[PDB]
């Protein structure tokens, strides 16, 4: 008997490999900056959309092998987005594969909630966050345009 | 208006689903003993077969994980959120008729609806994650009940945003 | 040896598919909210974040796809990111636990068969007498409406 | 033993890889006639999801390669999302049983060789001839007609 | 101890694939530049953005999965990409499934999470691009800037 | 014109195929018995089999067909949608009223709302022989192969659907004359 | 500016904490030796660094020995050993710091002001590297990391954050220029 | 040209690599007989495309015949690999893409040589690459066995033909662009 956890589902990847992929998540969001916006001589308007908040909503898709709206289109930042979407792969099929080591061989019945009962709690969190961030802001600009 | 009447009707139908859900004594309908089949609750489990028929009892709610998530189980605190903010969506609705010119009142309906909805999301996954914690197990109608009123909730929750949306529209127009 | 139809859903419990379908409700009504409740944003709409552009993308996400639209505000982002890993981690589970439902035959290896994922064609193609449906009626309606 | 060059479609059966072909083609017909049918959203075509950029589109959807068109009518946002959910679970099966071939092949009582992949290397660098005929073919003929 | 090489990470697939999908997207880059852009009966300024350039990098991302902004609209560029994301989806399912097999029979052997050392190469070629990344950039820069101080 | 060529052509080839593969029993080369109330040792020759028989091919009892017993809660659904072949069937009554919406298409011209139910008569009814092949896959289911009447069937489900872009073409063409009119 | 401010700060954080980390103790809680190599042989809670390790507890509490830290397997080993990356961080965020100290003194010099930014980055990603070496050699050769681990930690952050801060102000000085004419 | 005289000296250089490639008996370093009554062989031997020779032994230098037909459909490997097509396809592709080249910098005005070459540089590294798979896949059917200098001409071969083949599609470009200017 060993009853599943809440935070379960980290238990493929090790703890040095989930502060590690935030250290690199950090650090490909702001080389990919600098390499882009750097340079006054492509300036002008700048040339490209990967600014700052934008440069981390990119490399926050590409690990979570969505989609987003930019794709870089210099070869200073292609090379940035060409060893982190390998990263990145690497790591998402390293989870899978040792998640389906820990179900296959247990040291097989349908996957239970309790044992993903952790995402849905983040997931719920992100969501009460994002309405807060939201109607924060909304009071912000709500008062300070009376006061105008 | 169609709106504003769809949104009164659903308020008070996710409100009366709730309501009757977190109390009504069937949300689980598992084999236990008040060894019979037991149409278990959110607070009592009552013999549904065999002898002392229809007989009640209170449920036995019991690392520090583990702990946490039987209080929050036991006090049902998401399912009462839930049937609470529920009620003071209602309430903004109903005082958004007394104050025409404050279109904040929906607005702050619309969050009721829309969070209490996550409410119940969360009362309705520590209500699995603990049942299961301590099979031929079925669940309910007092159950479904409760996740209907979720929907219910988020559609009443889009209506009212979608007013809000609409009431401010109107005053950039006149402008 | 006697598979079900909808046998393509024992990886994941009962209760993890009521509550996917419950997440994507609550995604979208957030997603919707955070990015057009605001009147100091409008002038047309800010974005293309509507009631059902909301419940696309969210459906576009799950499904590991991509739409044309992304999140551009903090407060849709948060919900756009929270989503993207509430669905990495489920996506692999169904594929991780495939795995061990398909490795230890529970009651040497054969291939798949049709009869395995049947139900994933008697649904397609029930979606696709869906869409001729609800473009009719459409047609039926926007004929006749205007004619008269 | 050596494996055989179209090996890599073992994991699924011979059935299920003939019906994955006739649902696309019944996805992009499907794709189409809702998306153009109707002569009420013409105002310039309503969309681009013509017969050919619908045959792209589920091929697309179906390698797990975002689409540059995606559908905004409600009956074409359905063709688009059941094909969605039957590729998910599709190749989602096929990297589920390709794992389950390859782990009862170990402990019987080892990396992939190109033994294993040859016929995917094939098939590519037949496409790709394939591509090259078919566009020098179409160089030959309007260069012909200028004469 | 059996410490886990640096690059382990390239263990599922052989030494041969690795090489052949090197050769596989050289070859495939090249097709889609030329079916594209050889033909001046298109040109009216170029019909595509499938330059060379821009055809390493639709090839790229194609094979890792990452989609991209552009898309062949030809006949024959549609021959080359619909061919080249069955080889990329193939590929990239049997390094799961075989990185699944070895995790797997390894764990049958007679705690188990993956650990740094495991994949500890995938970090490395990560800080080196980024700071190649760094280095292509400023000898940009650096150049430019010196034809400026001239002029 | 041409298009209204190709169509004909098409929905007939589509109509015939369909009606053969129905009609004809060579749609499983299994290995099974032809014959029945066996009197009173086992054995199975080869048959050739498809919708309706059973059919010995080698040994003795050469040509007997027997009525395959198709009913030997989810298996009594799929037995039924088995042993009835409505979807089977069902794709030549779609494809044969395809059919008489392209003939009266020439009669009642200027109904171009004929030409859609043409089309979309043409779709459905490939989409009907779809699932008519995974049922009939799924139910069946030692060595077995596919004759040519599985191969008429799963040929004309392609015939049709492309009758069928065919056939709503033609309907886009015909209200764009309209919007070219005016 | 306030920009200036932050940046200034935030400089000084990322190199104190470094520094600290290496100069420091505390990078890890496992159970080991304290006492020399000479007897009462016996494991004891020790509080290892990057350079020293440390008795935690016992009669040797506090008394602190030299990590005997000693093909591929050997550069690793060399790499972690002398500490290259923990150190080069240390010297890159030093560097920087310099450059936004000259900036005051030279305002129409700007590339000043981007190599401060880049060493920062550059500092960042050093750090990284460094994290990573000792990691995966300490665990080639139960435990818990300390502070000292967390301070560098922290500094990769602040030094990233830093960079950021420096790049925008390089952006700003060219774009002022740039809207003059 | 400078366009031009990588071309040239791009073609040469595929040319002569692959030439070498097909030619040389380094391919493969493997353990093998060098030899045509127990023989003691087993010595490490280096073998090419239709050659194998020992590197050490009493046979220091001896050669002999590979034997590549030692039941059906899998047999057209064995006769792919066995007449060395792809890897000769590329030789002769990458000749006749040279005969393009220069006949090109004489006739003039045709710019469809140009083009050709690009073709037939292009095609070359693609009979290149099934070749390549066709001899490693043979050898498997049949290991410290290590690569020799060999199959790494005829890696690198690969690679010159296609930038080749990038770079006669730009002069064809550029010519007809020339064109378009003028008009
Ligand atoms: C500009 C458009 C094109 C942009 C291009 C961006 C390139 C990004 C690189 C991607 C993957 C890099 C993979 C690196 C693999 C290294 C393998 C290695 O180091 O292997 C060592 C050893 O040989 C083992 O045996
Ligand atoms: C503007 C750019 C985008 C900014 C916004 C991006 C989205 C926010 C969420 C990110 C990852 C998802 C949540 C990750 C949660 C990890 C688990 C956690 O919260 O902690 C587990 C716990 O530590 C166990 O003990
Ligand atoms: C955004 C607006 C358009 C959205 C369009 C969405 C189309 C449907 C998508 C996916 C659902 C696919 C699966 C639906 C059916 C699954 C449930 C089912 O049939 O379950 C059977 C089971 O046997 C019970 O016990
Ligand atoms: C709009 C244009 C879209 C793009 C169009 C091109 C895309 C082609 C994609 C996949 C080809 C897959 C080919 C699969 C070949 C299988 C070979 C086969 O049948 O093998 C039988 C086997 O050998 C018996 O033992
Ligand atoms: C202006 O500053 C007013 C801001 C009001 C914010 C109200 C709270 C935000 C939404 C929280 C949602 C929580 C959902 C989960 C409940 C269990
Ligand atoms: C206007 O009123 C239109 C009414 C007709 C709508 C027809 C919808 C199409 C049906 C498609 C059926 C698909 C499945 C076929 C096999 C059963
Ligand atoms: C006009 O008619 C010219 C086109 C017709 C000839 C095309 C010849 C080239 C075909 C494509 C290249 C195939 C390469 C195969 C490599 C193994
Ligand atoms: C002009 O002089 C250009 C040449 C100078 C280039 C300097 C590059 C510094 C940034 C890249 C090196 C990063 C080091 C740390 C990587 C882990
Ligand atoms: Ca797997």
Redesign the interface.
């Known amino acids: 008997k060993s ?1 599943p ?2 935070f379960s ?1 980290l ?4 703890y ?2 989930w ?2 992929i935030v ?2 998540y ?3 969001s ?2 990919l ?3 882009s ?5 492509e ?2 308007q700048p040339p490209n959309e990967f600014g ?2 934008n440069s981390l ?1 990119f490399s ?3 690990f ?8 870089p289109r210099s ?6 987005g ?24 247990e ?2 019945s ?8 952790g ?13 807060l ?3 924060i ?2 009071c912000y ?2 008062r300070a ?1 009376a006061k105008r | 208006g169609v709106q504003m009447l769809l949104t009164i009707v659903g308020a008070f139908a996710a409100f009366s689903l709730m309501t009757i859900a977190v109390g009504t004594d069937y949300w689980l309908y598992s084999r236990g003993v008040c060894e019979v089949m037991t149409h278990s609750g959110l607070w009592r489990t009552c013999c549904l077969e065999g002898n002392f028929k229809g007989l009640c009892k209170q449920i036995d709610h019991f690392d520090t994980a583990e702990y946490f998530l039987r209080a929050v189980r036991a006090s049902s605190i998401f399912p009462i959120l839930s049937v609470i903010l529920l009620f003071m969506g209602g309430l903004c609705i109903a005082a958004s008729e007394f104050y025409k010119t404050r279109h904040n009142i929906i607005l702050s309906a619309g969050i009721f609806f829309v969070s209490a909805g996550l409410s119940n999301i969360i009362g309705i996954i520590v209500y699995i994650s603990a049942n299961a914690g301590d099979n031929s197990y079925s669940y309910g109608w007092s159950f479904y009940f409760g996740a209907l009123s979720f929907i219910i909730a988020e559609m009443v929750g889009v209506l009212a945003v979608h007013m809000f949306i609409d009431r401010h529209k109107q005053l950039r127009a006149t402008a």
């Not at chain 1, 238990?11 to 090790?14: E, K, Q, V």
């Not at chain 1, 916006?37 to 001589?41: E, K, V």
């Not at chain 1, 979570?64 to 794709?71: A, F, K, R, V, Y």
Request: neutral net charge.
């Open positions: 009853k956890g809440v589902f238990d493929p990847l090790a040095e490999i502060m590690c250290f690199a950090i650090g490909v702001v080389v900056f600098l390499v916006r750097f340079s006054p001589y300036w002008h700052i908040f909503w926050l898709g590409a979570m092998q969505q989609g987003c709206d930019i794709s070869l200073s930042g292609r090379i940035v060409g060893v982190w979407w390998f990263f990145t792969l690497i790591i998402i099929s390293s989870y899978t594969a040792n998640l389906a080591a820990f179900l296959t061989v040291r097989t349908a996957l239970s909630l309790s044992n993903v009962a995402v849905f709690y983040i997931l719920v969190g992100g969501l009460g966050l994002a309405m961030v939201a109607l802001e909304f600009k709500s345009e």
